[PDB]
């Protein structure tokens, strides 16, 4: 409830999380055994005023408006791991939990 | 007023969504947590409350009860302990014929398929049954569904997986002394074997009689396996931070220290068992 | 080869900074941790090692001893690998004893506070000499600063803004009318402790809550100890037990506040723990 | 050692942390007693390839290039609080840690 989820049917301008399936075979990640595909999701949309901002720093910097400071951008504020079975660099079969593969939540930073 | 994505546990509004909206506009969807505040205030006042006072005060939740809440697929609305509507996992378990435990992809045993579907919904969106029954050690009497096949990981856990049966038509030498024409081929054969074979070194296998016959590359060093009469190129670049008995029948302080000694001496060492050889 | 921001604890390279450059290029700044790998490889292979294998192997640290390292202002290089350690200039400090940091913590001396500032807390400075104190009794603030206490009675030396721009009347819990928030804050600052806002508008000589009309979704709470009311938000929820001024025990401080809000009776904590 | 720090005299194109002081008086945040000013810093610079990316998710989304996905942006990957003394909404003197006021590290997300 900390973020917005959208889909293809949404008409949402704000920073929002959308669906996306990643298919490893199609990406060239041929060392992965399982899973073959997974829902990674992604973040998209606008960051105006302080909408969807969790950190006071963000708007403090925007008002200070210093040189080189771009506007805030829509970005993951929470990530989740996925469990994978894959071949390591020695071609051994390894089960491991791989951090930060999935976006759980999007916000403006 | 202002529209917020949530009422915090302290009861105040957080996560600004929109300004200059009436309650009717802010609350016009089925989204569970959306909340509203009446007051329109200047920026600084807003910041004052959001940052230094725990959120905007007089936060009014759009949904006071389960009426009109749209939890989405496989979820239902139920009032919680603090009397607030909540979306809770309610998977349809109605068409499930298998009644016993199941082994999830995560390698964990679930009580039954209904419990796995709950964990999928609650925590692990990529969770699925990989095979029926409890999760197993070794592939002995593991019968994988359909045309998937059994392999074990580094801890002897059994998984049912689909082997990449078709490689695209970079030589490698496996620790089995077999030359493979690519990674894909070595991996395919590993999958069919059901356990790691392991990469010995890049290029074609040679009938080495010692490490002198093997020219490692990529900053690797040759380790000789006296049990099988074959060599192996290993990185030897890892640093070390439960004593083990190695295949040389010596005790090392750690599996990591054993690897350091293997690497130093050019002799392949494997853990035989835990604790001192003596 | 590839240039990396650091060598991890496992010895492998991490945090890709630049690709396809030579050791001398990568290693050409004063950055302590920068590291290099020789092999240029295709993208997927690179991702494979970074994500699934603990980083890029055969990581070669640019700086293996202290020579050529630029630790920056306040710090100096020292072997532990080489490491940048905090070494503030203390040779010029006159005061010798404990000091109270702006963070409210006592430091053994100013030099220790300096090192903590360099190490952990960039905003850290001395607010007054000696140990940090409870209450403002015998706290002698330096310069033009004055003492105030926070919600736990800790003393701070601060600079009480004394300039207010002369419709926004406020009634303080002291029964005094202030012409603005700025004035109430100035008086509070001069008093040395919270006075607090009773309600918007000028104070009225109220005899009960019926005499006070709260504004903006607030409820009147009557203080029977002093015979004055205040308007409180009463909007907070409760997600150690206390003994309240009604001499009753409440499961929590805001359970107490909830009871106060419902009854219209101001309640304060007498002490922590059951009555 | 996880990020880059830069000053006005850097010729660093990549995502970097730069200094910036925030002055609360200048901002008109007049409920703040102390401190009056602090070092907030800010993030600026380019994010190409997989440079300065901590999460594998970032490049995976890039490869897929779904509608609405913007390249990675240079953003805080580590924030710090500061200790503050201020008047709360009841005009009480409060000491507290205010989270996420300072950027410690910048990275490409």
Write out the strand line-up for the largest beta sheet of chain A, numbering strands in chain order: 3-6-7
Strand content of chain A: 35-45%
Which term fits the overall shape of chain A? elongated
Quick one: overall form of chain B? elongated
Range of helix content of chain A? 10-25%
Largest sheet: number of strands, sense, barrel closure of chain A? 3 strands, antiparallel
Distance between the termini of chain A: 18 Å
Overall domain count of chain B: 4
Oligomer: heterotetramer
CATH class of the largest domain in chain B: Alpha Beta
Give the SSE string of chain A: EEHEEEHEE
PDB class: signaling protein/cytokine
Keywords: TB domain, disulfide linked dimer, Glycoprotein, Secreted
Assembly: tetrameric
Entry title: Crystal structure of the myostatin:follistatin 288 complex
Report on this structure.
The complex is a heterotetramer, with 2 copies of chain A (109 residues) and 2 copies of chain B. With 109 residues, chain A is mostly beta strands. Chain A has a single domain, classed as Cystine Knot Cytokines, subunit B. Chain A is built from 2 helices and 7 strands, in the order E-E-H-E-E-E-H-E-E. Chain A has helices at 24-27, 56-64, and strands spanning 16-18, 21-23, 32-34, 37-39, 42-44, 74-87, 93-108. Chain A has a 3-stranded antiparallel beta sheet with strand order 3-6-7, with no helix packed on it. In chain A, a hairpin with a 5-residue loop joins strand 6 and strand 7. In chain A, 50% of the residues are buried. With 278 residues, chain B is of the alpha+beta class. Chain B has 4 domains: 1-96, TGF-beta binding (TB) domain (Extracellular Matrix Fibrillin, Alpha-Beta Complex), CATH 3.90.290.10; 97-169, Wheat Germ Agglutinin (Isolectin 2), domain 1, CATH 3.30.60.30; 170-207, Wheat Germ Agglutinin (Isolectin 2), domain 1 (2-Layer Sandwich), CATH 3.30.60.30; 208-278, Wheat Germ Agglutinin (Isolectin 2), domain 1. Chain B contains 5 helices and 19 strands. Chain B has helices at residues 23-26, 43-52, 113-122, 183-193, 255-265; strands spanning 2-7, 13-18, 35-37, 60-61, 75-79, 85-89, 102-104, 109-110, 129-132, 149-152, 158-161, 172-174, 179-180, 199-202, 221-225, 230-234, 244-246, 251-252, 271-274. In chain B, the strands form 7 sheets. A 4-stranded antiparallel beta sheet of chain B has the order 2-1-3-4, with no helix packed on it. Chain B starts with a strand and ends with a strand. At the B-C interface, loops of B face loops of C. Chain B: Interacts with GDF11. Interacts with activin A/INHBA. Interacts with MYOSTATIN/MSTN. Chain B: It comes from Homo sapiens. Chain B: Disulfide bonds join 3-26, 13-59, 27-62, 66-77, 71-87, 89-121, 93-114, 103-135, 139-150, 144-160, 163-191, 167-184, 173-205, 211-222, 216-233, 236-263, 240-256, 245-277. Chain B: One of its GO terms (molecular function) is heparan sulfate proteoglycan binding. Chain B: Glycans are attached at residues 95, 249.
